[PDB]
Design a protein around this motif. Structure first.
Motif, PDB file in Angstrom:
ATOM      1  N   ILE A  58       0.851  -1.183   0.000  1.00 11.23           N
ATOM      2  CA  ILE A  58       0.000   0.000   0.000  1.00 11.23           C
ATOM      3  C   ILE A  58       0.888   1.235   0.000  1.00 11.23           C
ATOM      4  O   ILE A  58       1.916   1.272   0.687  1.00 11.23           O
ATOM      5  CB  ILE A  58      -0.956   0.023   1.212  1.00 11.23           C
ATOM      6  CG1 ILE A  58      -1.388  -1.396   1.593  1.00 11.23           C
ATOM      7  CG2 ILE A  58      -2.171   0.886   0.915  1.00 11.23           C
ATOM      8  CD1 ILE A  58      -2.331  -2.042   0.622  1.00 11.23           C
ATOM      9  N   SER A  59       0.494   2.244  -0.775  1.00 14.09           N
ATOM     10  CA  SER A  59       1.230   3.504  -0.851  1.00 14.09           C
ATOM     11  C   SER A  59       0.223   4.634  -1.004  1.00 14.09           C
ATOM     12  O   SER A  59      -0.371   4.798  -2.075  1.00 14.09           O
ATOM     13  CB  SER A  59       2.224   3.497  -2.013  1.00 14.09           C
ATOM     14  OG  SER A  59       1.561   3.311  -3.252  1.00 14.09           O
ATOM     15  N   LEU A  60       0.030   5.412   0.061  1.00 10.54           N
ATOM     16  CA  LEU A  60      -0.900   6.540   0.063  1.00 10.54           C
ATOM     17  C   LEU A  60      -0.114   7.788   0.454  1.00 10.54           C
ATOM     18  O   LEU A  60       0.031   8.088   1.642  1.00 10.54           O
ATOM     19  CB  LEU A  60      -2.068   6.306   1.019  1.00 10.54           C
ATOM     20  CG  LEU A  60      -2.634   4.892   1.186  1.00 10.54           C
ATOM     21  CD1 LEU A  60      -3.806   4.904   2.154  1.00 10.54           C
ATOM     22  CD2 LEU A  60      -3.051   4.298  -0.144  1.00 10.54           C
ATOM     23  N   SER A  61       0.388   8.515  -0.540  1.00  9.20           N
ATOM     24  CA  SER A  61       1.181   9.713  -0.308  1.00  9.20           C
ATOM     25  C   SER A  61       0.319  10.956  -0.493  1.00  9.20           C
ATOM     26  O   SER A  61      -0.430  11.067  -1.467  1.00  9.20           O
ATOM     27  CB  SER A  61       2.381   9.765  -1.254  1.00  9.20           C
ATOM     28  OG  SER A  61       3.157  10.929  -1.028  1.00  9.20           O
ATOM     29  N   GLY A  62       0.432  11.884   0.445  1.00  4.67           N
ATOM     30  CA  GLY A  62      -0.323  13.117   0.396  1.00  4.67           C
ATOM     31  C   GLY A  62      -0.613  13.614   1.799  1.00  4.67           C
ATOM     32  O   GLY A  62       0.106  13.302   2.742  1.00  4.67           O
ATOM     33  N   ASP A  63      -1.690  14.402   1.882  1.00  2.00           N
ATOM     34  CA  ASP A  63      -2.092  14.993   3.181  1.00  2.00           C
ATOM     35  C   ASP A  63      -3.246  14.192   3.780  1.00  2.00           C
ATOM     36  O   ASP A  63      -4.113  13.727   3.007  1.00  2.00           O
ATOM     37  CB  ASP A  63      -2.442  16.465   3.034  1.00  2.00           C
ATOM     38  CG  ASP A  63      -1.319  17.346   2.505  1.00  2.00           C
ATOM     39  OD1 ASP A  63      -0.855  17.088   1.375  1.00  2.00           O
ATOM     40  OD2 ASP A  63      -0.914  18.277   3.232  1.00  2.00           O
ATOM     41  N   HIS A  64      -3.247  14.042   5.097  1.00  2.00           N
ATOM     42  CA  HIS A  64      -4.273  13.317   5.851  1.00  2.00           C
ATOM     43  C   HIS A  64      -4.362  11.859   5.390  1.00  2.00           C
ATOM     44  O   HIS A  64      -5.389  11.382   4.902  1.00  2.00           O
ATOM     45  CB  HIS A  64      -5.631  14.020   5.744  1.00  2.00           C
ATOM     46  CG  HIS A  64      -5.602  15.460   6.154  1.00  2.00           C
ATOM     47  ND1 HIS A  64      -6.023  16.479   5.326  1.00  2.00           N
ATOM     48  CD2 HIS A  64      -5.200  16.051   7.304  1.00  2.00           C
ATOM     49  CE1 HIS A  64      -5.885  17.635   5.949  1.00  2.00           C
ATOM     50  NE2 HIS A  64      -5.386  17.404   7.151  1.00  2.00           N
ATOM     51  N   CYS A  65      -3.242  11.162   5.562  1.00  2.00           N
ATOM     52  CA  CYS A  65      -3.147   9.735   5.276  1.00  2.00           C
ATOM     53  C   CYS A  65      -3.290   8.982   6.593  1.00  2.00           C
ATOM     54  O   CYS A  65      -2.328   8.871   7.361  1.00  2.00           O
ATOM     55  CB  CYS A  65      -1.825   9.403   4.588  1.00  2.00           C
ATOM     56  SG  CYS A  65      -1.432  10.472   3.185  1.00  2.00           S
ATOM     57  N   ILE A  66      -4.488   8.465   6.853  1.00  2.00           N
ATOM     58  CA  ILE A  66      -4.827   7.842   8.127  1.00  2.00           C
ATOM     59  C   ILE A  66      -5.266   6.409   7.870  1.00  2.00           C
ATOM     60  O   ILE A  66      -6.018   6.142   6.926  1.00  2.00           O
ATOM     61  CB  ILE A  66      -5.929   8.624   8.865  1.00  2.00           C
ATOM     62  CG1 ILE A  66      -5.732  10.132   8.681  1.00  2.00           C
ATOM     63  CG2 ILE A  66      -5.946   8.259  10.341  1.00  2.00           C
ATOM     64  CD1 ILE A  66      -6.859  10.970   9.236  1.00  2.00           C
ATOM     65  N   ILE A  67      -4.793   5.490   8.709  1.00  2.00           N
ATOM     66  CA  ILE A  67      -5.197   4.089   8.670  1.00  2.00           C
ATOM     67  C   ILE A  67      -5.949   3.792   9.959  1.00  2.00           C
ATOM     68  O   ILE A  67      -5.387   3.915  11.054  1.00  2.00           O
ATOM     69  CB  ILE A  67      -3.994   3.148   8.505  1.00  2.00           C
ATOM     70  CG1 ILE A  67      -3.390   3.294   7.106  1.00  2.00           C
ATOM     71  CG2 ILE A  67      -4.405   1.706   8.764  1.00  2.00           C
ATOM     72  CD1 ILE A  67      -2.299   2.291   6.801  1.00  2.00           C
ATOM     73  N   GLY A  68      -7.209   3.402   9.831  1.00  2.00           N
ATOM     74  CA  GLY A  68      -8.070   3.161  10.968  1.00  2.00           C
ATOM     75  C   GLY A  68      -9.127   4.244  11.119  1.00  2.00           C
ATOM     76  O   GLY A  68      -9.266   5.148  10.293  1.00  2.00           O
ATOM     77  N   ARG A  69      -9.882   4.128  12.209  1.00  3.31           N
ATOM     78  CA  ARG A  69     -10.927   5.103  12.491  1.00  3.31           C
ATOM     79  C   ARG A  69     -10.319   6.469  12.786  1.00  3.31           C
ATOM     80  O   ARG A  69      -9.239   6.574  13.373  1.00  3.31           O
ATOM     81  CB  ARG A  69     -11.792   4.635  13.664  1.00  3.31           C
ATOM     82  CG  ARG A  69     -11.068   4.548  14.996  1.00  3.31           C
ATOM     83  CD  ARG A  69     -12.028   4.176  16.116  1.00  3.31           C
ATOM     84  NE  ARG A  69     -12.153   2.731  16.273  1.00  3.31           N
ATOM     85  CZ  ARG A  69     -11.982   2.085  17.418  1.00  3.31           C
ATOM     86  NH1 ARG A  69     -11.679   2.727  18.535  1.00  3.31           N
ATOM     87  NH2 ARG A  69     -12.122   0.763  17.443  1.00  3.31           N
ATOM     88  N   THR A  70     -11.013   7.520  12.359  1.00  3.50           N
ATOM     89  CA  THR A  70     -10.543   8.887  12.545  1.00  3.50           C
ATOM     90  C   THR A  70     -11.725   9.837  12.404  1.00  3.50           C
ATOM     91  O   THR A  70     -12.849   9.427  12.103  1.00  3.50           O
ATOM     92  CB  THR A  70      -9.427   9.236  11.556  1.00  3.50           C
ATOM     93  OG1 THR A  70      -8.984  10.579  11.789  1.00  3.50           O
ATOM     94  CG2 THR A  70      -9.911   9.103  10.128  1.00  3.50           C
TER      95      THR A  70
ATOM     96  N   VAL B 225     -12.066  13.995  10.994  1.00  4.53           N
ATOM     97  CA  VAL B 225     -11.441  15.214  10.498  1.00  4.53           C
ATOM     98  C   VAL B 225     -12.518  16.276  10.336  1.00  4.53           C
ATOM     99  O   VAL B 225     -13.536  16.040   9.675  1.00  4.53           O
ATOM    100  CB  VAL B 225     -10.706  14.974   9.165  1.00  4.53           C
ATOM    101  CG1 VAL B 225     -10.030  16.253   8.693  1.00  4.53           C
ATOM    102  CG2 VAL B 225      -9.692  13.849   9.312  1.00  4.53           C
TER     103      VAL B 225
END
Lengths: 86, 86, 86
Positions: free
Chosen positions: A69-81, A83
């Motif tokens: 997995i590759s998620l580059s950028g702003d607000h890269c969250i894994i799991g509950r959150t 915003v």
């Protein structure tokens, strides 16, 4: 024989022969499975109840295994959150 | 034989032969599984109840195993969080 | 034989032969599994209840095992957190 994997003469079962040759792999590799071997007789050269076990269990909601997995950028969250903007 | 893995003569079961050759791998590798071997007789050269066990358990919500993750940037959070702007 | 892993003559089960050759690996490797061996008879060359056990348990929410993670930047947090701007 220079380079030779699994060279043999005679009898006897041969199981699970794996040759891996990677050049700049950059990836996941998974080898798995159970092996059972038995040799009897062999003259002139008692039953055992058993079981091999390699299972798994567990309950989740987000489950990633042997992945890339590759998620580059702003607000890269894994799991509950949560915003909130302004 | 120069280079030779698993060279043999005769009898007897052979299980689990693995050859790994990596050049700049940069990755995960997982080998797993259970092996059971038995040899009896062998003349002129009692049952045992058993079991091999390699399982697993456990409950979660975010579970990552043998994976490759790359999240570059701002606000890179793993797990529960709460972000409020202004 | 120069270089030769698992060279043998005769009988007897052979299990779990692993050859690892890495050049600048930079990665995780996991070998696991249980082995059981027994030899009986062997003439002219009592049952035991048993079990081998290699399991695991435990409950969580964020669990990472044998993985590679890289989160470069600002506000790189692992676990629960709370970020408030202004």
């Amino acid at each position: 024989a220079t380079k030779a994997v699994c060279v043999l003469k005679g009898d006897g079962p041969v199981q699970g022969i794996i040759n891996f040759e990677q050049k700049e792999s950059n990836g996941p590799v998974k080898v798995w499975g159970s092996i059972k071997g038995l040799t009897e007789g062999l003259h002139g050269f008692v039953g055992d109840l058993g079981n091999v076990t390699a299972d798994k269990d567990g309950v989740a909601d987000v489950s990633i295994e042997d992945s890339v997995i590759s998620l580059s950028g702003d607000h890269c969250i894994i799991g509950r959150t949560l915003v909130v903007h302004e």
